[PDB]
Amino acid sequence: LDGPVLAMLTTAQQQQGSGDLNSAAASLERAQRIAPREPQVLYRLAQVRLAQGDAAQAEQVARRGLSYANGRPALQAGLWELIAQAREKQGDSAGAALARQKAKVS
Numbered sequence: 712l713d714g715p716v717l718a719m720l721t722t723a724q725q726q727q728g729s730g731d732l733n734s735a736a737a738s739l740e741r742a743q744r745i746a747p748r749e750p751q752v753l754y755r756l757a758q759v760r761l762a763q764g765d766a767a768q769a770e771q772v773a774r775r776g777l778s779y780a781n782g783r784p785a786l787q788a789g790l791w792e793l794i795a796q797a798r799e800k801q802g803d804s805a806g807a808a809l810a811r812q813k814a815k816v817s
Contacts, residue, residue, distance in 0.1 A: 715745045716746045716749060719738050719742035719752075720739075720742060722738045723736075723738035723755060724755070726738060727758075732759050736760065740756070743756075748779050750777070750780040750783065751776075751786065752776075753772050753776030754776050754786065754793070757769040757772040757773035757797075760772060761793060761796060761797055761800070766796075766800035769793065770793075770798065770801075773793040773794050774794060777791070784817050788814045791813045791814035794810040795807040795810035795814070798810060
């Protein structure tokens with residue numbers, strides 16, 4: 712396992728788990744300096760932003776992670792569900808259903 716990326720993920724999850732979504736986001740942006748193309752980093756980053764209520768932001772991060780998630784179906788399913796939840800919180804139930812449709816058949 713790649714230690715540096717995993718260290719930042721681990722640190723991010725400890726911070727999110729503690730209620731410090733700001734630092735978690737900072738830790739995940741530091742993770743990108745090591746792994747700018749890691750969809751799992753983007754997945755967690757989109758989660759933290761979504762948990763902060765920054766839905767439109769989360770959606771674009773998750774949509775970016777998706778472009779790097781090719782041939783990783785469990786992860787693409789996860790990212791689409793995140794995108795659905797981000798559309799929902801933006802008042803968009805059509806784009807949310809269409810996203811959950813892509814999560815179910817990827």
